[PDB]
From a paper:
The post-translational modification of proteins with ubiquitin (Ub) modulates an expanding array of cellular processes. Ub is attached to a target protein through the formation of an isopeptide bond between a lysine in the target protein and the C terminus of the Ub. Ub is a target for post-translational modifications, including acetylation (Ohtake et al., 2015) and phosphorylation (Kane et al., 2014, Kazlauskaite et al., 2014, Koyano et al., 2014). Several sites of phosphorylation (Thr7, Thr12, Thr14, Ser20, Ser57, Tyr59, Ser65, and Thr66) have been identified on Ub within mammalian cells.
Here we used genetic code expansion to express and purify multi-milligram quantities of Ub bearing homogeneous phosphorylation at Ser20 (Ub [pSer20]), Ser57 (Ub [pSer57]), and Ser65 (Ub [pSer65]) from E. coli and to solve the structure of Ub (pSer20). Phosphoserine was directed into the protein using an evolved SepRS/tRNACUA pair, an approach that we previously demonstrated allows the production of homogeneous and site-specifically phosphorylated Ub and other phosphoproteins (Rogerson et al., 2015). We obtained crystals for Ub (pSer20), which diffracted to 1.55 Å and showed clear density for the phosphate group. This underscores the quantity and purity of proteins obtained using the evolved SepRS/tRNACUA pair (Rogerson et al., 2015). Serine 20 phosphorylation has been detected repeatedly in human, mouse, and rat (Choudhary et al., 2009, Lundby et al., 2012, Manes et al., 2011). We conclude that phosphorylation at Ser20, Ser57, or Ser65 does not affect the first two steps of the ubiquitination cascade with the E2s tested. We conclude that Ser20 phosphorylation on Ub changes UBE3C from a dual-specificity ligase that makes K48- and K29-linked chains with unmodified Ub to a ligase that makes predominantly Ser20 phosphorylated K48-linked chains with Ser20 phosphorylated Ub. Our results suggest that the phosphorylation of Ser20 in Ub may shut down the formation of K29-linked Ub chains formed by UBE3C, and this may enable the proteasome to resume proteolysis and aid cellular recovery following proteolytic stress. Ser20 phosphorylation increased OTUD3-mediated cleavage of K11-linked Ub, but it decreased OTUD3-mediated cleavage of K48 linkage. Ser20 phosphorylation increased USP8-mediated cleavage of K6-linked Ub, but it decreased the USP8-mediated cleavage of K11 and K48 linkages.
Numbering used by the authors: 1 to 76
Write the structure that this text describes.
């Protein structure tokens, strides 16, 4: 399925994902498109930070959902 991610430039990118994909894998697919290393990524959906180790299905992220990417560091 397709989901959307709003990135640090404000652009909305598309990702090709499956419900059993881990958040770490979603971060790796963001790196593949946008170059941002996964340890610097924090993904937000419906007001929750998405934990590494959990899956898209754990957060009920269904097709055509939009996630928000923010920087995880302290500075920025």
């Amino acid at each position: 399925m397709q989901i959307f991610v709003k990135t640090l430039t404000g652009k909305t990118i598309t990702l090709e994902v499956e419900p059993s994909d881990t958040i770490e894998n979603v971060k790796a697919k963001i790196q593949d498109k946008e170059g941002i290393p996964p340890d610097q990524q924090r993904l937000i959906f419906a007001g929750k930070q998405l934990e590494d180790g959990r899956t898209l299905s754990d957060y009920n992220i269904q097709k055509e959902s939009t996630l928000h990417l923010v920087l995880r560091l302290r500075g920025g």
